[PDB]
Amino acid sequence: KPKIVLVGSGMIGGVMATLIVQKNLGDVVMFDVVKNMPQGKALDTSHSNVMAYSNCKVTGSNSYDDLKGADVVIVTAGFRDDLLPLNNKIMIEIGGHIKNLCPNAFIIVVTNPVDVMVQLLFEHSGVPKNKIIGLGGVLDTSRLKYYISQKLNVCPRDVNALIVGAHGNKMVLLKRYITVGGIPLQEFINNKKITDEEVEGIFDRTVNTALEIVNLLASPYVAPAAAIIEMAESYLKDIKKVLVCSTLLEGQYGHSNIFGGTPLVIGGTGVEQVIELQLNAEEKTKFDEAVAETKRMKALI
Amino acid sequence: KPKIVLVGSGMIGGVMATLIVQKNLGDVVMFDVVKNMPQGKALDTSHSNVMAYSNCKVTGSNSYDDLKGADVVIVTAGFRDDLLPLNNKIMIEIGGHIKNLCPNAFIIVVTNPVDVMVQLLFEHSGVPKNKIIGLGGVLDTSRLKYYISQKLNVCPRDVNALIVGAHGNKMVLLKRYITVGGIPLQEFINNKKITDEEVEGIFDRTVNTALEIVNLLASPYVAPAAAIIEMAESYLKDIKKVLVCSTLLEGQYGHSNIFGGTPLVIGGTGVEQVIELQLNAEEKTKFDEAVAETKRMKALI
Amino acid sequence: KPKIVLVGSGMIGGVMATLIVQKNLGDVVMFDVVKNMPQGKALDTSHSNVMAYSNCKVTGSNSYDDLKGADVVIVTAGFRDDLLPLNNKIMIEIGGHIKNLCPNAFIIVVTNPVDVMVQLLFEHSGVPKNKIIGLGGVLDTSRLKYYISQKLNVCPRDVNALIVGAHGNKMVLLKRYITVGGIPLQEFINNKKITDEEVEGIFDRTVNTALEIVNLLASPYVAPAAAIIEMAESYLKDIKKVLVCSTLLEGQYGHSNIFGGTPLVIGGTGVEQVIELQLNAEEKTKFDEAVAETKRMKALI
Amino acid sequence: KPKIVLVGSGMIGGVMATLIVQKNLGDVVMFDVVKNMPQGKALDTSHSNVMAYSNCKVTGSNSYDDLKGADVVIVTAGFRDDLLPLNNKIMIEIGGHIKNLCPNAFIIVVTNPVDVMVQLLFEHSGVPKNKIIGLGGVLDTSRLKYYISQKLNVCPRDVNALIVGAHGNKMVLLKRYITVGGIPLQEFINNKKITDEEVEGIFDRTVNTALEIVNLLASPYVAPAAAIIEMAESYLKDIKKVLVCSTLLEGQYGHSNIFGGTPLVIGGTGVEQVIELQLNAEEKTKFDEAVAETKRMKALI
């Protein structure tokens, strides 16, 4: 049975464990530095195996040895430049344990700013570049896809969209790469089913969604968890989905030695392909600005 | 598209909305008297439609008119005898809205003490007796089934067990009615795969599980949500599952005018059958004690 | 519980009934003019409810009254111009029963040539134009999507493609409308991950797939059944998927009074939108040739 | 990705491949000695990956080397005592290839008479006794469970029942071990929801179901395929379901050196437990008669 370790058992961790049991994906360790809490969540979640017809062990842990033999490790733990050293320390610690205990794990990093933190954990863990990625594009594009789908009254999954560069305020929303049922969004604009102005409003809403939800006396954890589990499941079941995630750039987009958000393929060997978009000059300028902010923060460590 | 209204958008409500989207079961209204919070949770949850390949609207509301045309209403709202009047007031209010806005809804009550509150909402809403039930047995038995399954190393769902009478400390764990893969538990005791003492320990753990989880710096909401959605789904898809829930007793077990936990069948018309267990005298004594506590609290309203 | 009637219980019908039970989608009537056969298939299939955790009645019938109250009707029955009158007779008979017994059903026609037969059944049944469609594009594009996905080593569903006009040898494969993870196929050609020549080979293979399978001592029924059930499920669950199907053209593509393959949206009210592709002149010429063959055969009835 | 090889690509094989793709369970090889046919079925089935959101390779083969690295092997190939030598020859051939090419595979045998043939393949393949079982109980009990569920108007899966000894006319239907929602069937008889006479009629129908379906101008393959895939999935996902299958008896029921139908647990290591029912004397007499027929035929090889 696959073993999935959640390093961080906050709200996102809770939904992830719930979904893993629903999908019968693997045994789950809910790890956290906070005592008792993950044990309680794990106990609650384990009972849902009955309703789900599943058989996944769900355990809680404050003990790093439970990383042993993990097939997937998802890192949400962490404490705005002033947070960079603190969270780097966490990545140092986690990285050591990964190298010691599950060097062959597929690693998904969520800790913000994710495009910096994923590279830090890469550096501190020594795992292969095809075995560690950051959450970004699957989540951000889920917002864009959903809002467009509601304007056009179609199934959310039938909207495809790419958001690249970085996860955060400089995320690059590529209008040219939006399709609906495989059809260019521009055709729907031409047919007056949606306007350019509605699309720009949706772009603004997408960039600011975390803020919107925070201001609504909540915080995002359901969709982040679902995005992470889509990525993890594509690895565990070798589905080879095309998913936009943060990955090491080795020449793509003219960049090296930095992680950035780009479409890639997740299969049973990890990142099987990194897909380099043929961005035009203006799109490329936006991509470069996103990654430049990642570089700026990386240089501060 | 079916419409499911969650009256109460706390932790249990959050997991319920998540699961409804995963299962593509229906549009969801997350209702709460707390402003903004359900709107935030609903917005977050709606994005997960993309990952789930679903198309369920998820909206938040502080407005009771959103009960209009609900097919299923799940009540978790509410504020230990001294809480009975307070929560009764809530049931009065909700009941009026149900009668006005969704008199044909299937109603699942969770507010504790559930066996009292479900009858109060029945009385204040005027819905048919086959259209309103309380959460209890599916949740409690999920604990018992799970713990036994881990002792015997089998799939949790392959353990069947009945817990009856009431949801709470007087719940009746019927040892005679435990089976594993359809086989009496006694055969596994005879074969020394599990002992009577282990089973009694598991009974104690089952009764006190909420307390265990609360003491572990958490609180149960994942398994409660999964239990509720199993009940709701059996109604919405006319599955006719046998599920132990709190229902109006009309002569069964010698009781009338009171709700108690018993196996029943949930299908597209609501409670299609109430199954009366042929309890022996000792089991019956325990059942009567559970329901007597429900009567005691009902008499205080 | 939804009621799905399969008018025709051959191989495609068998797989459809199997999938409906797996998905717990509705009660199934397997209708056929051949005595006993559908009763046997239905009996076999009904047992699989146990393995699937479903509760769908599956019955066999040689009796047209079992169309009564059908929510979905799928027509595969039928006996190459010389077959047109014969199959028209079948559509006359079925049409009468539909009008009498399930005038509100959503109708999916498969009988070939489907773009002619769907219009004949429309004419003989009197159902609204938004409530009857023909199988074509979902099946044909499943071939194109699959073959491209195997060249590029990605999840089959992540390839999107449109095939329009008609189902049969004149089907129009729109190279410009192929995307992979939302990205234009041309980018993958530019990057030498696939060539124009491979794509043309795949186009030829797609057009001739039925012939390939027939020559391999088989015949296609699994993918046709899966395509039909994807369409039916989008209706039954109001998913509003964008699916390419044969539908009445009322001005789109400059055509009237004829059915043709085009992207459309299937939701709970039937065809909720017909999407008119903004074809260029060359693409339009191919579309017109496909539909001209449909017109030619329609004129022979 | 797990690899599942179907040795035999007839009707049962076709449904198995279909279900494996629906469940995204693994790559599939459809093997058959008949040329071209499995290649055609495999090609058809592979396209359904698009509709299922799956990524399973489906290939056809007449070449035994495609057994290499199989995780699961399902044997339906084979040509009434006079058929025993013929089918034994097939088991000799297959057995050699298994030992050579996939000695660690989990093997499910279907070829009739299954309780004899599974032991022959065990003997000719050299695989461990916990890694090879025969289809019987899951299929037979699916009939019994389904028919009882329709009498009582409950979800089919909520009926549990055990049928033991052998698969065929001497199958032992254990009335004492039938439960409904975990409740003894006898309670439903006492309450006049079903009679002893109805139950005996259902027993007769269960024993003779294959004959019923054959006489209805069909033959059973959907439910057999679903039963086999339930067994295979319990292995592949380590679910540890309790499933009644044919397995080597090593003292259980007083028998040795023979395979018989009994509840057992299927998990990731194969047969993890063989559960010996505590049969009473009369039940035991019936069990012995079933297994005696298996012994009689085994002695003829």
Residue numbers in the entry:
A (entry chain A), B (entry chain A), C (entry chain A), D (entry chain A): 4 to 82, 95 to 316
Authors' description from the paper:
Previously, we identified DNA aptamers for the specific recognition of Plasmodium lactate dehydrogenase (pLDH) for the diagnosis of malaria disease in human blood samples via impedance measurements and colorimetry. The dissociation constants of the DNA aptamer pL1 for the recognition of P. vivax lactate dehydrogenase (PvLDH) and P. falciparum LDH (PfLDH) were found to be 16.8 nM and 38.7 nM, respectively. In this study, we determined high-resolution structures of the pL1:PvLDH complex and apo-PvLDH by X-ray crystallography in order to understand novel ssDNA structural elements, ssDNA folding and interface features for specific pLDH recognition. pL1 folds into a hairpin-bulge contact by adopting three novel structural elements defined as a T-loop-like motif, base–phosphate (BPh) zipper and DNA G·G metal ion zipper. Therefore, pL1 recognises PvLDH predominantly via shape complementarity between inflexible regions and many bridging water molecules (bridging waters).
To understand the conformational change between apo-PvLDH and pL1-bound PvLDH, we determined the crystal structure of apo-PvLDH belonging to I222 at 1.6 Å resolution. Conformational changes are subtle between the apo-PvLDH dimer and pL1-bound PvLDH dimer, with an overall root mean square deviation of 0.94 Å. Therefore, shape complementarity between pL1 and the inflexible regions of apo-PvLDH is critical for interactions between pL1 and PvLDH.
